[PDB]
Amino acid sequence: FMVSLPRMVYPQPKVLTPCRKDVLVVTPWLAPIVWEGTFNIDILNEQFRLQNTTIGLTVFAIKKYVAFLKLFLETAEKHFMVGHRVHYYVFTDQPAAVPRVTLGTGRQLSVLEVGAVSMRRMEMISDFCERRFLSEVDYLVCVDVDMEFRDHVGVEILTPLFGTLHPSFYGSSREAFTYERRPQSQAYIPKDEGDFYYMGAFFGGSVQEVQRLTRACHQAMMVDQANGIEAVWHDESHLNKYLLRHKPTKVLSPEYLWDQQLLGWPAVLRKLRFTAVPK
Amino acid sequence: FMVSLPRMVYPQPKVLTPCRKDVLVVTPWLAPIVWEGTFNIDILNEQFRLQNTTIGLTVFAIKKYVAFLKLFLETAEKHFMVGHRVHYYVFTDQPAAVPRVTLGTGRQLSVLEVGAVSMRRMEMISDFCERRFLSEVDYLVCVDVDMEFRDHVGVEILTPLFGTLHPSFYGSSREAFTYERRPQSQAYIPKDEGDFYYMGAFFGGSVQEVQRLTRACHQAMMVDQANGIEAVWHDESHLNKYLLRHKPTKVLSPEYLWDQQLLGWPAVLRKLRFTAVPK
Ligand SMILES: O=c1ccn([C@@H]2O[C@H](COP(=O)(O)OP(=O)(O)O[C@H]3O[C@H](CO)[C@H](O)[C@H](O)[C@H]3O)[C@@H](O)[C@H]2O)c(=O)[nH]1
Ligand SMILES: O=c1ccn([C@@H]2O[C@H](COP(=O)(O)OP(=O)(O)O[C@H]3O[C@H](CO)[C@H](O)[C@H](O)[C@H]3O)[C@@H](O)[C@H]2O)c(=O)[nH]1
């Protein structure tokens, strides 16, 4: 049950004035594509705070990648779901290397130790922490650690299932996408199929939908392993196959996954929100 | 649980090419606004057929308005949710005046007799047929009878909660909207509030959300009656108040509720789908 929004004063949306004319803001299956200028964050914040929404954020920091945690977490505190309930889940082989980061109120961090590559992330999210995530959070957001937040990443992303447009491929035609192209792989996508190329570094949704996605990808990766094949881009190849066959209910624009050193700051990006750190 | 979509061949959506540049296609709360060119109906049909979706359509035909049923139903057979399961619910004071209309396979019609204005529709949808609708259909669509279908009205509209832009007000600023303006009415909306002016003639959603809306509107109308006030546009005024405080998850463009005699055929409408019949 959703209680009423309070009175709010904000600019009237105008039917004959688009928010953005330079980009696609809705997919052909009627999922919003999230760009700056498409959302009023005050309305969304109200809607999600009225539901007392809790967001879980999973991040893996294994071997040398523990070095990225301090900047990742400190910038998440500045920019990620501020004002909402957040539970960070840090999967690591080195619990003692997790930096002590000061958190805002209503935010918590759990260190989840894993044993000392390819299948780990999907397997861990789907086999290991199922009951815990279902009890503790409403949405799960699953991101790479070799990253920093530079600008707002908030409840505009939340939806039953989302993926994020890969920053190197958003202008590419589907035949150029680096999908798995061998029919012997479960991740196979023919050259005449595909909506978008989603990056493995930022996906999410409701706990149920994320567990479905990660379970399916893990099972598909296990089939490939049994058949002696490894998809060209590993879990990203499987993620792409899953999201082709199970359409996401929002798609995040490359504002949400960018590499400025590689790709600069194109006119189409009004904000760079979550960006690669050099490695 | 949603099974996988099959392989499909269709045009690739292109991120740097909008579907429509002349209209707003997403609200500031990230609800799609449904216009021609924004959706691939083949993808949507697959998604909804895989769930074996059943759509209930409620229509009231009381007193002289029984005359509109033949054209309403015959054109609904041509254009409304064709290929999907449909259950028509015809509320009337004259069961014997309901025309015998031949239905396509997977479609059924029930005549629901009511006693021989203002509060009837919201009351009937919310108090009377609650358990029945919950058992029989997945979505409810609630429309005026003084109408005909001229073009496709399909699963692109389906969502937890939708309203439809009134054809006379889609270009209007909010101060011009004919919302109830007296603070003594439960339907009151001040001049600095409002997203859109929705028409009472086409709303819907999941059965649960439609029952919530109609219950709230009925209760609000009963409060007004007890206080000796009747909102300026009756149930439409209350519908507008509800949808201001409970944002719809899709908004239908005026393609879905048009009067060609009154308003012609503007460039912004590529299709006229559901249109007023003279009276
Ligand atoms: O030694 C490692 C390697 C990786 N990671 C974790 O795995 C994430 C992904 O690895 P990278 O950041 O090194 O890789 P990319 O940003 O290039 O990710 C892409 O390339 C990967 C292969 O290197 C996979 O194919 C993945 O699906 C694809 O999105 C990291 O952020 C980190 O969270 C570790 O913790 N330790
Ligand atoms: O004698 C009647 C009158 C109305 N109706 C039913 O009520 C629907 C709505 O009535 P109208 O079509 O006459 O009215 P509008 O199309 O002008 O509807 C608008 O005006 C109404 C007042 O006339 C209400 O305010 C309503 O909320 C608003 O959308 C009809 O389609 C019909 O389904 C009947 O069955 N019999």
Ligand SMILES: [Mn+2]
């Ligand atoms: Mn990375």
Ligand SMILES: [Mn+2]
């Ligand atoms: Mn009418």
